[PDB]
């Protein structure tokens, strides 16, 4: 888990999160994403995070490359480089003329698998949105930082417990996000009509030019009863079905 700082050449700040400072590098030949944190020394709770990034790994998850802990308090995480970056920004600048059925379905699976995964390891993210996804040079979608009213499930907002059914709800939102090419969800509903209207049994309309097959997956994840929404297993089943039976093209 250790890396020697000296042979790592920091390049530039690709990220300015009000929660952290992200940068590019190159250690021995491979470009790397280095999460730089000062914030006093409150770069700590991020070490507990950097921990489960060791006993939990999928190829659909941003691979934790290693950790550099120097004397002078330079606390820095090193993650695998996701070339293209934020999925939300990408969807928005490239739009439909670039991302066709194939491309969106790919993205969609590269997640339901990284989720199907964390579902067996007994895990729960609590923060599933496309601002939080990243993209590799060669069109692969990977999650980033473990944990926002609009994405949370209804039950979860009333309490403090986020199950695996909470995440299946946030997946629904994130699908709509994708087939909207990065619209903010709930397009014509005021910030505190969101939870009421939803609890009143409301679901967003099908994103434009959205394949019916996909919109059901969504509605599916938005079942009022958390027990009646699918799992990150049944989902991948439905996604492949759709995929294989070319229901996106």
């Amino acid at each position: 888990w250790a890396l020697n700082m000296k042979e790592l050449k920091l390049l530039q700040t690709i990220g300015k999160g009000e929660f952290g400072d992200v940068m590019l590098g190159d250690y021995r030949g491979n470009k790397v994403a280095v999460k730089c944190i000062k914030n006093d020394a409150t770069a700590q709770a991020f070490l507990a995070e950097a921990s489960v990034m060791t006993q939990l790994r999928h190829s659909n998850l941003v691979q934790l490359l290693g950790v550099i802990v120097e004397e002078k308090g330079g606390l820095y995480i090193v993650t695998e480089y996701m070339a293209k970056g934020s999925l939300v920004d990408y969807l928005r600048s490239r739009g439909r003329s670039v991302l066709g059925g194939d491309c969106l379905l790919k993205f969609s699976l590269d997640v339901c698998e990284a989720m199907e995964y964390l579902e067996g390891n007994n895990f729960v993210h609590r923060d599933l949105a496309a601002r939080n996804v990243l993209v590799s040079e060669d069109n692969v979608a990977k999650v980033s930082d473990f944990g926002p009213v609009k994405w949370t499930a209804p039950e979860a907002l009333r309490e403090a417990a986020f199950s695996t059914k909470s995440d299946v709800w946030s997946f629904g939102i994130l699908l709509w996000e994708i087939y909207s090419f990065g619209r903010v969800p709930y397009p014509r509903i005021p910030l505190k009509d969101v939870v009421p209207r939803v609890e009143k049994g409301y679901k967003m309309d099908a994103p434009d030019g959205c394949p019916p097959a996909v919109y059901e997956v969504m509605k599916n994840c938005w079942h009022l009863d958390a027990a009646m929404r699918p799992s990150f297993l049944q989902l991948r089943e439905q996604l492949e079905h759709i995929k294989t039976h070319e229901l996106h093209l």
């Binding site: 920004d89 928005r92 600048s93 739009g95 003329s97 090419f181 397009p187 014509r188 509903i189 005021p190």
Partner: protein, 265 residues
């Protein structure tokens, strides 16, 4: 043709504006419909070069595009179009009513233009000359795109023209997004000339050196933010019109849920 009609269908009632090509009139079509009639002044341009200006609009059709009704290919040549009673956006911005416009209306106007441009985008066309001057306004602040510019991506005003198009003729839809960026400035400054205190020749160079227009007075910082996104030196990562329409259409449900009616905005 079939887009053709007889001169009698038409009654020319009030003249609206001029130009080298001829004139524009408000008229009645079949005694029942207000229309705008574009007219060829004989000998100025050729019936073909003229009637070519309406070709594209036989194929395209969209709520936020000023639509084509009919032509008259004969000796006094006519193009017949929908009537946008308030004239051009720019003129309007500068007028009595232009000064009373508050941000939400201004934003929604942008949304509407964006809505049309978005359609142009789906269709693989390019507008080429985007600015409030080339936008028409109807009753109730309805804004549409018009009969100037659009080829399919199958004379520029420098200030509105993206560097790569101004330099290489790389007129793309992203080039149009850039213009939409400058367009936004006109909207929020009551129609002022972008890059004030800068001459055309100077402008392109400044822009090359990374220069971008500051946030205008009383324009929100999220808005000016969107603008700079449109002005990204790199075509590929400028926003898409789909997102622009979306962004503006939801501006108040997302970006600024606490808008405070300013003095001018």
């Amino acid at each position: 043709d079939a887009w053709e009609i007889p001169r009698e269908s038409l009654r020319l009632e009030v003249k609206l504006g001029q130009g080298c090509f001829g004139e524009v009139w408000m008229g009645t079509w079949n005694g029942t419909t207000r229309v705008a009639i574009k007219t060829l002044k004989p000998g100025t341009m050729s019936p073909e070069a003229f009637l070519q200006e309406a070709q594209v609009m036989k194929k395209l059709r969209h709520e936020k595009l000023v639509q084509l009704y009919a032509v008259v290919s004969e000796e006094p040549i006519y193009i017949v179009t929908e009537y946008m009673s308030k004239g051009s956006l720019l003129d309007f911005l500068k007028g009595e009513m232009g000064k009373y416009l508050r941000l939400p209306q201004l934003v929604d106007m942008a949304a509407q233009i964006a809505s049309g441009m978005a359609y142009v985008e789906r269709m693989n066309y390019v507008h080429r000359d985007l600015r409030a001057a080339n936008i028409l306004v109807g009753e109730n602040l309805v804004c549409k795109v018009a009969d100037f510019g659009l080829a399919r991506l199958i004379k520029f005003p420098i200030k509105w023209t993206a560097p790569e198009a101004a330099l290489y003729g790389r007129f793309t839809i992203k080039s149009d997004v850039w213009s939409f960026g400058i367009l936004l400035t006109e909207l929020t400054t009551k129609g002022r000339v972008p890059y004030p205190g800068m001459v055309n020749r100077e402008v392109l160079d400044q822009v090359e050196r990374g220069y971008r227009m500051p946030c205008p007075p009383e324009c929100p910082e999220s808005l000016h933010d969107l603008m700079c996104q449109c002005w990204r030196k790199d075509p590929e990562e400028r926003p898409t019109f789909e997102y622009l329409q979306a962004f503006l259409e939801d501006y108040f449900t997302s970006t600024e849920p606490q808008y405070q009616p300013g003095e001018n905005l």
